[PDB]
Amino acid sequence: QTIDDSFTEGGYISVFYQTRIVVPLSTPREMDILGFVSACNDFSVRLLRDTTHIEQKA
Amino acid sequence: EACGYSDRVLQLTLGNSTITTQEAANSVVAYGRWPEYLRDSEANPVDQPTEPDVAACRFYTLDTVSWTKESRGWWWKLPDALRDMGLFGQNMYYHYLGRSGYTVHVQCNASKFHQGALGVFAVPEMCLAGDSNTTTMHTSYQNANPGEKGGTFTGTFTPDNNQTSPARRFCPVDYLLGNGTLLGNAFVFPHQIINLRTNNCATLVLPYVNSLSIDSMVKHNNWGIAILPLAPLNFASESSPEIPITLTIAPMCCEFNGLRNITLPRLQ
Amino acid sequence: EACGYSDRVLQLTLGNSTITTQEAANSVVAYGRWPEYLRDSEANPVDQPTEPDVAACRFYTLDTVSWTKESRGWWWKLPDALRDMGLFGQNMYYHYLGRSGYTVHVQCNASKFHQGALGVFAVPEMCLAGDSNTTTMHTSYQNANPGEKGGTFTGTFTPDNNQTSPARRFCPVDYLLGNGTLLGNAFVFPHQIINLRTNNCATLVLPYVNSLSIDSMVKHNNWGIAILPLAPLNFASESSPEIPITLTIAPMCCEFNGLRNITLPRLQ
Amino acid sequence: AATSRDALPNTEASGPTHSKEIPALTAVETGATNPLVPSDTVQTRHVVQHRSRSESSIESFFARGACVTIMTVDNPASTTNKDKLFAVWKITYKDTVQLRRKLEFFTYSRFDMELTFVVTANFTETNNGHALNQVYQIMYVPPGAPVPEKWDDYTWQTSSNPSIFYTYGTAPARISVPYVGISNAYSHFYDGFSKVPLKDQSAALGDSLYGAASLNDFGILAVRVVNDHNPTKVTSKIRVYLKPKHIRVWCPRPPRAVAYYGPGVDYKDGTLTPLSTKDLTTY
Amino acid sequence: AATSRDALPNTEASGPTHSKEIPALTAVETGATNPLVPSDTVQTRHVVQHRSRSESSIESFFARGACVTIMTVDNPASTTNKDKLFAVWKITYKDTVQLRRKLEFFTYSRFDMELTFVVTANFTETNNGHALNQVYQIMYVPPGAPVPEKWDDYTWQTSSNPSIFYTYGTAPARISVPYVGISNAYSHFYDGFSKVPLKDQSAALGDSLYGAASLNDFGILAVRVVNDHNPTKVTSKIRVYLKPKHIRVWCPRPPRAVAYYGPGVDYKDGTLTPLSTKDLTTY
Amino acid sequence: GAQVSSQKVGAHENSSTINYTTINYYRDSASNAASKQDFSQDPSKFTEPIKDVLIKTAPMLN
Amino acid sequence: GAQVSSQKVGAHENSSTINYTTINYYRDSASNAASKQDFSQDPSKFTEPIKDVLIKTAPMLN
């Protein structure tokens, strides 16, 4: 279900330090990592419906 | 090639101009469509078209901008940005109608000790949001078209309050792609990422895109070139580093119709 | 491959776990023998064996240890080290007999400005020397088997003097491979060297080795994983540098016999 | 050859791997998305796939009647001093948000348009008098044609313009319209202007709205109650349902993330913070 | 090959018997039922059987429109202080008993659903004013979609959701719905929970209803009167008839013997004595 | 696309098989009416679920 | 002029492909209903718009 539901729950996605980010001198000890999500060719959706991500109060 | 050839090292040649690069992340061809001339089956204007070829279909280098910890992003519009570029701008202004593709080459080098990621995006019909909350679609022709120097994005939306004498210009907020939609999704659009640790630049080959076979290049801008810092510039320990972002662009398979006297726009 | 492929870049996949590496010095297969199930011609225990497959034959990551100028070396024993690892440890304890191969992946990255060489060795029947000079072969089951956290080597042999209440544990001296023989020769054993300037890690594929077709995994440890600093850790100028050594291991073609009630060992 | 309703690709049985091949590793910088599948990073079993993308196809996604406007007309008592109220609506999909946001997932579009009209009426005054069954006249006035100024002037003759004479209480009115654009495809977005500001010519003259093409894209819908003034006043409402059929779309875009503010892409202060608070390390 | 409407097996002529064969004798302990027939225990004549099980087939047994709910909506006078009453019903076959008991003769089920809507209206006040013919809007709101808060808020646009615009006095509305279950078959019974109570985690958190799966199985039916507030108040009722077509059923069960008590199998004190008094030796 | 079938005829008039014609108007199976052309099956899986097939003339328990 | 097609059948009754008949009453294509008989295409032009075709098993950057 396209909503928060105990019965149809997907599980947990977590990230960790296997070893540790190592850098030499004269270099920034802090950096940013960007993350992207997309669907595999086995992916599909059904039961067309109106979304809550947009509205017209008035 | 066991012979030497590689994805990172390219050589682009158009007319009398040639671009070389030893650190590229391959190249992108918008919607898998390589620029092309207007076909007879799809043609509209009946008059013999003007095809400048090498005189206009070459590489023009715009004014180099500076990337810093503070930078929120930069934007340009085509053909607007090339309007004053040699024979291409001349032919664009002398004709009622005109169509053109582009080879966009964004240059930005640094060092193995620098950090940062430039999100380079090619957006069809890149309509931007205005600076007014009392009125709409009010951004003036002069302000909507910065020419070669282009415009820039803001981390914050600050409404034009001078009702009497309106700034009549754009207020493009970075995280909203300057147009009411979330930046994180800008990737559905033809693009490339300039990740300092991986590559010097971004090469995008753009086709002529539009609801019409050919249109008014002076009244209408087909493509929008948006460059935003996905990951902020950062160096060794310097609190205020800096690196240049040079933008070189070349018109392609471009052609023009409806020839008459030169168009002298009110650009100020 | 002119297509791209290379010795330094590998991708290992077992069950639901996958390991990637861009800086490897190839991989080693102990005695040229790839792990395999017990053949009918060589089989002993007549009962239908238990083959956990993907549930146990996957990658378990043990507790990450710290490498420093002071470190004399680290040691582990198989299967002992994996005894508490998910479904593999469960099946090992529920059965009288068990046999298993391993894919040992030692991870240790740094920087082009760091120095040092980790000697990673896979030793069959790695019997270690005790801490006592008044008695012999006295090292207790609890101390001989540290489990996941493993043990460590000492630059000096210091005898347990408490005759009344003996420490009853090992005193493995580095230069003597913890067992009465010269370290310089440990290389006759299946191994790889983690030389900071050349590679991030060491991958050793170990086969089931032993005087018997299948044995008691709880009473007996088939392989010993010894990691010693051939060349001491060193960085730029820092007087006390540090880098992590993470050890990830995966059981292979593993199978079990003589099923009964779970074995609850006196590990303390 | 691949049909929108064909079963998606079957998951193939995949075993262990110790090779120089690195599917999991890549470089998003190139502008491309890693074509990976479960069997590339983990040990998979063989699965015969029955699932389909039938309902997510362009036609299927829009194959639904959506409300684009509510027109208000009326029929007062002859005596009243105020004029008989007849409706004039400038045709468009932007007066409402739902359908507009969906169409806007894309830059250009092409399609035959199906307009369905739901008409509801009611009494306004604590009166008691009644009214005979009303007959509505929905006239389509294309750009250039004489726009009606009175609920009963000469224009309602519709000699050339298309008019729908709807009878109250009967099945909601419905008509189909071809791809009528003066362009090879509808433009959900126009990054330019209808005019070119010429130096040599007075500022105010060369001026025009940003992102706005034909001042009058598709003309207007002029609705009225054909019946003569009735002693007892009756107010009616015409709900217009728009459905895009035989549709095609080009150049995808990121959905509208913040409250619509006018016919253009303009956003308004106080509505720019869509996303809610949620910690980096909290499930 | 045997059709639901094929004539049952003919009774064969059977004479006297003095043999070692014992059909009449058996052992129910094995879990099986003695396949006996009249000719096995008595002398029978030859009879050509014409009777059929046509009407007792799964489809035939349920091939009937059954009332699952009665929705109440209304349209008051603009002035009234109280809100225009629009209905919101959570779709299900358990609000009523008849159809539920029939479906429950089985553990699992599968079928295309046919929903028929009977709409009746009436006047509430000893008034005398009238009201123009009403037009109802039956909107289907699937789990996740913006549920309506006002008889006239933005949600009624139904850009994506399926809506039925019914006109009073006209043939009762009707629509068909496929097998929409997220499972390979509808579960008349779920011997478990939607959540797993984890020690390491606070009691109240891991808690959930017994026998209850998806908190929101199939969304809801949102009904309203499209017509604007009318001086004279008119109350309407929407009766929903549910018919299971193209149906399949698995694992049979003993019919509900005692009064239903909620959506689950729960029984209530004072209702546990169905059977009546009747003596062992009395005809 | 017309589907012609046979009506199992009950009470015949003083008036050879009789038929009825059916045609599907919609693209979705769900929209379709009930054929009623259904099949019977042998109760075995419920009346005799036992491992060892049983012969009625012989002793159930042996 | 009747156009006969196949219904992709979902939940089948205890009752071979099933069909539905369609006929166009109007002269103008616009008047016609939606076939829903639509085609899928490979995302390539958007997920992999790169000049040099990419092989997933090999290094994206080489």
Ligand SMILES: CCCCCCCCCCCCC/C=C/[C@@H](O)[C@@H](N)CO
């Ligand atoms: C009696 C009823 C006659 C109905 C006549 C309707 C004809 C007009 C239909 C115009 C269709 C406009 C659809 C939306 C187009 C917009 O997206 C444009 N701004 C884009 O090009």
Ligand SMILES: CCCCCCCCCCCCC/C=C/[C@@H](O)[C@@H](N)CO
């Ligand atoms: C405009 C009207 C649209 C009507 C939309 C109806 C769609 C929802 C139908 C859900 C069918 C539910 C049938 C009963 C299922 C229950 O037995 C479940 N608890 C069992 O899985």
